[PDB]
Design a protein around this ligand. Structure first.
Ligand code: NA
Ligand code: NA
Ligand code: NA
Ligand code: NA
Ligand code: NA
Lengths: 4, 100, 276
């Protein structure tokens, strides 16, 4: 992903 | 969070035969978190030249590692695997059994 | 067959002692073929199977780039998660992810995966329909809202639907001689007296690939659930697997017991017995  | 105690199996890659080179395996699995210390023991002494797989994990997210080294079984030598983990109070040692 | 390409990642914070440790691995079916370990001086994504070594310099450059970008984000995520759960600055935490595609016997995307865990517990996973997310708790619900806002599900599905399968087919071709060869188990039964009137029969399955196998004992054709021990399938270290199952039996009654082994490498289910 691109950031939790 | 969740911490899990490693399962430990010690075994050879191929059916053991005295005088026939082989690989001695210690498979630690189902543990969490990932830091773990695993030693292969020959007559109680730590073996050098022990390698291990790259850290991986199973479907429940618990880790597993294979530690292994070359060995040539004979009638006199005893082998074991010794494991330290945060979940373990002191090291846990499992003796190699040729029938398992 | 129904093959899979899957990547797994572990990020472990080391607070007060520098950067986290990132260890990433990739698999086709049950065969590992790449790794990335942040603990080298100049870490690179590296081959771990002979049939990927032929990929050119550009492949390794891009997969190293990918790994480092992933590590950058995992670093940030470990930070974010510590805040979400209002945890102390001290103490190590673990973030894990897994993602990949299954190729269907019909040559199309059969299933997709994208899952994450924090300190060993499910955190957020892509639904099987590949359209939406499943959040374990209120912290993961915040991640879910951000990933909906960036339409991540659709973007990741496009990876699963296209390049994931493309690369999987290429791997399967380049390693067809090992990847597409079902190594059957070599099987036998050993006999170990336990007393003057009982003995252990141990049924072995050795050297098989892929890992999926069933091994059970029967007495007079009935499934045996008492007096038994089975070990979980375990790696031999050469790319194949092992498993055994043992049953304690009355001496003189060994021939009532049969071991049953099923594996992709065996055309029929195998029925075996101890053979003195
Ligand atoms: Na270690
Ligand atoms: Na300990
Ligand atoms: Na197959
Ligand atoms: Na094979
Ligand atoms: Na079969």
């Amino acid at each position: 992903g691109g950031g939790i | 969070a969740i911490q899990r105690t490693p399962k430990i199996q010690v075994y050879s890659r191929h059916p053991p035969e005295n005088g026939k080179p082989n690989f001695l395996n210690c498979y630690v699995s189902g543990f969490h978190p990932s830091d773990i210390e695993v030693d292969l023991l020959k007559n109680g002494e730590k073996m050098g030249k022990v390698e291990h797989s790259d850290l991986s994990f199973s479907k429940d997210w618990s880790f597993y590692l294979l530690y292994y080294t070359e060995f040539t079984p004979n009638e006199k030598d005893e082998y074991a695997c010794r494991v330290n983990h945060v979940t373990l109070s002191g090291p846990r040692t499992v003796k190699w059994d040729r029938d398992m | 067959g129904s093959h899979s390409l899957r990547y797994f990642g572990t990020a472990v914070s080391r607070p007060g002692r520098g950067e986290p440790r990132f260890i990433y691995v990739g698999y086709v079916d049950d065969t590992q073929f790449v790794r990335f370990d942040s603990d080298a001086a100049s870490p690179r994504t590296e081959p771990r199977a002979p049939w990927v070594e032929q990929e050119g310099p550009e492949y390794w450059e891009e997969e190293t780039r990918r790994a480092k970008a992933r590590a950058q984000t995992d670093r940030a995520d470990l930070r974010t998660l510590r805040g979400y759960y209002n945890q102390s600055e001290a103490g190590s935490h673990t973030l894990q992810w897994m993602a990949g595609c299954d190729l269907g016997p019909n040559g199309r995307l059969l299933r997709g995966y994208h899952q994450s865990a924090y300190d060993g517990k499910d955190y957020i996973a892509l639904n099987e329909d590949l359209r939406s997310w499943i959040a374990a708790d209120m912290a993961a619900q915040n991640t879910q809202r951000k990933w909906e806002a960036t339409r991540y599900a659709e973007r990741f599905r496009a990876y699963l639907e296209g390049p994931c399968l493309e690369w999987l087919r290429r791997y399967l071709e380049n390693g067809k001689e090992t990847l597409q060869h079902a190594d059957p188990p070599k099987t036998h039964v050993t006999h170990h007296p336990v007393s003057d009137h009982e003995a252990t029969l141990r049924c072995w399955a050795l050297g098989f690939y892929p890992a999926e196998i069933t091994l059970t004992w029967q007495r007079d054709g009935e499934e045996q659930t008492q007096d038994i021990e089975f070990v979980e399938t375990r790696p031999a270290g050469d790319g194949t697997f092992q498993k055994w199952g043992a049953v304690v039996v009355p001496s003189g009654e060994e021939q009532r017991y049969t071991c049953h082994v099923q594996h992709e490498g065996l055309p029929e289910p195998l029925t075996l017995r101890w053979e003195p």
